[PDB]
Amino acid sequence: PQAVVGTGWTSKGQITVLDMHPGSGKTHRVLPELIRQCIDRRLRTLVLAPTRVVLKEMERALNGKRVRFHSGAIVDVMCHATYVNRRLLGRQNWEVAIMDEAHWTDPHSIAARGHLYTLAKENKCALVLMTATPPGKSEPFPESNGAITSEERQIPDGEWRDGFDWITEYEGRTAWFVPSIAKGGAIARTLRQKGKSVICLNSKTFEKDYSRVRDEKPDFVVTTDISEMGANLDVSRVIDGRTNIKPEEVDGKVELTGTRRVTTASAAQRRGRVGRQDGRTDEYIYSGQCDDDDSGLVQWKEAQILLDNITPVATFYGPEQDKMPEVAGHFRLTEEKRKHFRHLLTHCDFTPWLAWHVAANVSSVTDRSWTWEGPEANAVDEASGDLVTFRSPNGAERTLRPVWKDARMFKEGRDIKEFVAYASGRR
Numbered sequence: 001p002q003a004v005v006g007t008g009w010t011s012k013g014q015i016t017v018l019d020m021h022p023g024s025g026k027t028h029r030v031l032p033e034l035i036r037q038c039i040d041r042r043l044r045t046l047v048l049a050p051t052r053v054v055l056k057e058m059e060r061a062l063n064g065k066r067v068r069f070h071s072g073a074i075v076d077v078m079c080h081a082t083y084v085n086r087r088l089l090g091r092q093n094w095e096v097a098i099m100d101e102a103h104w105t106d107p108h109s110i111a112a113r114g115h116l117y118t119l120a121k122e123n124k125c126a127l128v129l130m131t132a133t134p135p136g137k138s139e140p141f142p143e144s145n146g147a148i149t150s151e152e153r154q155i156p157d158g159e160w161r162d163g164f165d166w167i168t169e170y171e172g173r174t175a176w177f178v179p180s181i182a183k184g185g186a187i188a189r190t191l192r193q194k195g196k197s198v199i200c201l202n203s204k205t206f207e208k209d210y211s212r213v214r215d216e217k218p219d220f221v222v223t224t225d226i227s228e229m230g231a232n233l234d235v236s237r238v239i240d241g242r243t244n245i246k247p248e249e250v251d252g253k254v255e256l257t258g259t260r261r262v263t264t265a266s267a268a269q270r271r272g273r274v275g276r277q278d279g280r281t282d283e284y285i286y287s288g289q290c291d292d293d294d295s296g297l298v299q300w301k302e303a304q305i306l307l308d309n310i311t312p313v314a315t316f317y318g319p320e321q322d323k324m325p326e327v328a329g330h331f332r333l334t335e336e337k338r339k340h341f342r343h344l345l346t347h348c349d350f351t352p353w354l355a356w357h358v359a360a361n362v363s364s365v366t367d368r369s370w371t372w373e374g375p376e377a378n379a380v381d382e383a384s385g386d387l388v389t390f391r392s393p394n395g396a397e398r399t400l401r402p403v404w405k406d407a408r409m410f411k412e413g414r415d416i417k418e419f420v421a422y423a424s425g426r427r
């Protein structure tokens with residue numbers, strides 16, 4: 001097993017960090033043994049999966065055990081977000097908490113591990129954090145079940161014609177990480193015009209396309225960071241430009257332009273898609289260096305927004321506490337405004353940032369006028385260059401011109417049409 005998970009790890013106030021490399025058995029070997037002990041010792045246990053794919057991983061791994069899975073049992077399994085979102089309202093309590101993929105910089109994930117750390121530090125519970133890359137540790141080349149040959153090469157950032165034959169002359173299957181859906185689209189189009197089979201994985205295509213990968217065995221999986229955790233792509237090569245999109249609050253608005261360098265935790269997950277089989281050598285082809293300074297991203301403000309509203313006094317998981325942008329509690333809402341906040345998160349697909357600004361500032365849950373009364377520069381444009389228009393229930397023609405402008409609502413995985421359903425009062 002692992003050394004620190006013999007006994008006493010289940011003791012209130014005990015925080016155990018399992019730095020375990022990719023493919024080392026966190027989800028399917030360690031976790032079911034932690035759960036067998038928890039059930040034996042009759043300890044109320046929370047298990048947090050980052051995503052639906054890892055949650056189904058856990059269902060197989062915990063098959064034949066009395067466990068309760070959340071979209072008799074004393075073990076509850078649910079997503080990082082599910083945990084945080086239910087605490088935005090008669091709270092359930094657990095004396096043991098296990099967080100799988102505890103490096104994830106999704107704001108729900110940062111908020112969940114901050115809450116659980118704050119509890120463990122108060123002797124309310126025992127916490128286990130499992131990840132290849134514990135927050136604090138900078139290691140882009142962790143250990144692997146088999147060998148990986150890593151080589152720096154120039155990687156195309158978009159369509160290309162000649163000069164990159166090493167890409168198409170490769171005889172195995174590849175996972176190519178791209179910083180955005182749109183960049184993913186341009187790479188896929190070139191690969192198919194070169195006669196390669198491609199499946200694109202991202203927030204729009206995952207639920208329908210991920211299970212085709214096993215079955216169709218495409219030449220290429222062109223994937224965003226959606227495939228960094230619990231995606232089994234069964235490839236022999238990763239291509240990794242080591243970039244990601246960077247949602248950033250700039251002049252009171254959330255922008256989504258350009259890229260940043262990935263963190264080491266991200267590079268390590270991307271590389272970790274390969275080298276999962278002893279006695280096989282796989283390839284990791286990358287371009288450039290990593291950047292662990294992600295303190296500028298809106299994710300940290302979004303994490304405080306969530307943590308401030310599920311909580312004394314709470315901090316982020318110790319090593320991340322430096323990236324909390326304001327003093328603890330800054331973002332706490334009244335109970336009534338928190339209800340509205342939760343509704344916008346869970347029912348309207350809002351970002352934490354947008355949901356907080358609306359719930360904090362808008363008198364009533366029925367108001368939609370904030371969607372057209374913003375400053376002129378906040379107007380939202382269709383691909384054809386015209387400003388989006390819609391009709392309020394009284395037939396008034398509106399221009400989509402929100403007071404609080406979050407680019408994430410209008411591209412990269414979200415559609416203007418779904419925001420208009422909200423803005424038009426069809427919600």
Ligand SMILES: Nc1ncnc2c1ncn2[C@@H]1O[C@H](COP(=O)(O)OP(=O)(O)NP(=O)(O)O)[C@@H](O)[C@H]1O
Pocket residue numbers: 020021022023024025026027028029030101131132145228229230231272276277
């Ligand atoms: N062929 C395999 N190689 C490695 N692990 C495997 C394999 N088949 C099933 N598994 C399980 O898959 C899981 C992968 O190991 P794990 O430590 O969870 O990786 P990781 O760093 O967490 N990478 P990821 O899980 O995708 O984020 C373990 O729980 C293994 O028991």
Ligand SMILES: [Mn+2]
Pocket residue numbers: 026027028230
């Ligand atoms: Mn895993």
Ligand code: NA
Pocket residue numbers: 198199200
């Ligand atoms: Na396809």
